[PDB]
Design a protein around this nucleic acid. Structure first.
Ligand SMILES: [Mg+2]
Ligand SMILES: [Mg+2]
Ligand SMILES: [Mg+2]
Lengths: 131, 67, 104, 57, 46, 105
RNA sequence: AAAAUAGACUACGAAAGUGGCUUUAACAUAUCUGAACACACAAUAGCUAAGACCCAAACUGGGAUUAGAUACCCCACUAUGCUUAGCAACAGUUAAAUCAACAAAACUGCUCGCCAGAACACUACGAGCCACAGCUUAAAACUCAAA
């Protein structure tokens, strides 16, 4: 599910006094009047809060997996409309491959975080075919 | 560089043909050349600037072109 | 007229050698139109060929299971119930009919 | 010439230069080493130079 | 600073209340986006 | 986001121009927009003859409507401009002020 | 329908490719090598179905021309050109005598694929299509001291 359109942008969510503000400025500063990239940023921020131990550390493998997952969701939403977009088809298939690679590395290094990631993002890890 | 500033954009077209000058004539750095080109086309298609000639009202502006 | 032999073709129903070429030959000419009557002797091996040809593109299959694809009918004028499956007309008859096994 | 860096490792003289002959109790050697990190340099060299001799003996 | 700037700016927006008045005021005003440049890189206001 | 509507309206008398401006701004607000400013660039001869709604125009009034609209609004508004008969030409662009000056030094 | 100027630009894209304007989506990946067999694309032939047909146009007709005319000029119109659906890599070096020659200055390391005379020779014992007489489809022997 997407964030509500009334949610404030990530950059305008900790500014002091944002609750003492007129409705019109709230609309101007919401996801209703921004392109899709802020909504994806909000999704990423929510997942980082929900899954990882340190939401601020973005270089960790779990953070990269979450980022690639939101990107993959974006590609699937895009291809649901542009069925003949071969470039974005390539991008989606590749991104799935590297997310599988990151999941393999996380499994081999940190199993607890791997379980948490797989539960939080609804990812079913599958072992590669032998032939 | 704004597409509505037809005076500035007319300082970079041929008075007799309306063709856009190149950077060897205008002397602009390539980035501003690209901005001027895109602005000129935007103005032409949005009904702000003539295409086959330079608007006569702007024939007496300073000549910044080496032609 | 008198009995006319159009072709002599070596097959082997067990290994399916020459069966596909037989189907291609049957689906390439103007004169091979209509019903097919698979005559033969007892040990000629008719049943194996019938089973082979039954499970192929030659048959107009409506289902996959060989029980329904082929039907049993009494031979006209007798009680000899025999198998049969429906076939396709050869290709020249779309640009511009039943199989029959007889007693050995 | 002989292929690979340090081809002398692939000579029976080098392989028999090893001096480690294990007691009958030892059955398994597992060697955990890191490909990167200066502190493991000797360990890396241990894998490169002396494992063939140990296995040979 | 951006938020405060919007606090001050949102006051003078065309709502559905002051629509007609602002439309007439716009019809009673003209704006000019044309300026010229010299070889010295100086803006020559019209 | 923030958009600018450049509008070329038919050369008409003031009451009808006001009516058309009210109608278009009302459409913008109906599609979810917050209109910021309305600026009149003036009545002027067109750079070239423009054929619209089975009529040939040589003169027109130029207007700018700054607004903030939800992204899905733009396409709809375009369709509406395609139906209004008093508009020779309407074009919606991302507002130039949002594009921040590149640091060419 | 396809995009003069900018473009004396050399950007984007994995490659093929992309240069009219606006808007919306949107441009994978924090080591490298590793696919005939996995997934995506891309191009090149040749046929098969239907469809459009302005224009051009192999073939095919018609007209004019020397003294075997123009093969070559003109007219008309096909297939076709169109639209669908189908059939060496990577990292580091310039130190050395660089250096069979010719190209394209030579190098290392590391990995994959490939190579061990002419010979990717020749040949139809046969096979398929055909249905008496034709078409398509091969390796090996064998020979030689060359290539
Ligand atoms: Mg690889
Ligand atoms: Mg023709
Ligand atoms: Mg390779």
């Amino acid at each position: 599910d997407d964030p509500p359109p009334s949610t404030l942008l990530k950059d305008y969510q900790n500014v002091p006094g944002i609750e003492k503000v007129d409705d019109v400025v709230k609309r101007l500063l919401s996801l209703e009047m921004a392109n899709k990239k802020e909504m994806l940023k909000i999704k990423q921020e929510q997942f980082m809060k929900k899954i990882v131990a340190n939401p601020e550390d973005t270089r960790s493998l779990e953070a990269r997996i979450i980022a690639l997952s939101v990107k993959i969701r974006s590609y699937e939403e895009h291809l649901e409309k542009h069925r003949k977009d071969k470039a974005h088809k390539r991008y989606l298939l590749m991104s799935i491959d590297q997310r599988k690679k990151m999941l393999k590395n996380l499994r081999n290094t940190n199993y607890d975080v791997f379980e948490k990631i797989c539960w939080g993002l609804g990812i079913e890890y599958t072992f590669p075919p032998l032939y | 560089v704004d597409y509505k500033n037809v005076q500035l954009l007319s300082q970079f077209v041929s008075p007799f043909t309306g063709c856009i000058y190149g950077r060897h004539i205008t002397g602009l750095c390539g980035k501003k050349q690209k901005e001027i080109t895109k602005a000129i086309k935007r103005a032409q298609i949005m009904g702000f600037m003539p295409v086959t000639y330079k608007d006569p009202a702007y024939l007496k502006d300073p000549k910044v072109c080496n032609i | 007229s008198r009995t006319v032999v159009r072709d002599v073709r070596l097959i082997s129903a067990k290994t399916g050698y020459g069966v596909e070429e037989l189907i291609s030959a049957l689906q390439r000419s103007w004169r091979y139109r209509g019903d097919v009557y698979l005559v033969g002797a007892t040990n000629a091996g008719k049943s194996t060929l019938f089973n082979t040809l039954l499970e192929s593109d030659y048959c107009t299959a409506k289902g996959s299971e060989a029980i329904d694809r082929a039907t049993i009918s009494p031979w006209p004028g007798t009680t000899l119930n025999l198998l049969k499956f429906p076939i396709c007309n050869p290709t020249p008859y779309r640009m511009f009919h039943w199989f029959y096994d007889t007693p050995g | 010439p002989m292929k690979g860096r340090f081809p002398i490792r692939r000579t029976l003289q080098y392989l028999s230069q090893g001096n480690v002959v294990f007691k009958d109790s030892v059955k398994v050697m597992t060697v955990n080493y890191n490909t990167h990190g200066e502190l493991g340099e000797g360990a890396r060299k241990f894998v490169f130079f002396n494992i063939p001799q140990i296995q040979y003996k | 600073r951006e938020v405060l700037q919007l606090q001050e700016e949102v006051k003078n927006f065309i709502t559905r209340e002051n629509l007609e008045a602002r439309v007439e005021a716009a019809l009673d005003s003209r704006k000019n986006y044309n300026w010229a440049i010299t070889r010295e890189g100086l803006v020559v206001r019209p | 986001p923030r958009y600018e509507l450049a509008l070329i309206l038919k050369a008409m008398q003031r009451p009808e121009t006001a009516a058309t401006l009210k109608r278009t701004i009302e459409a913008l607000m109906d599609r979810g927009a917050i209109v910021r400013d309305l600026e009149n660039l003036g009545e002027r001869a067109l750079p070239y003859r423009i054929s619209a709604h089975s009529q040939q125009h040589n003169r027109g009034g130029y207007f700018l409507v700054d607004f903030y609209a939800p992204t899905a609004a733009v396409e709809s508004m375009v369709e509406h401009l395609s139906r209004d008969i008093d508009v020779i030409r309407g074009n919606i662009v991302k507002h130039p002020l949002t594009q921040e000056l590149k640091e060419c030094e």
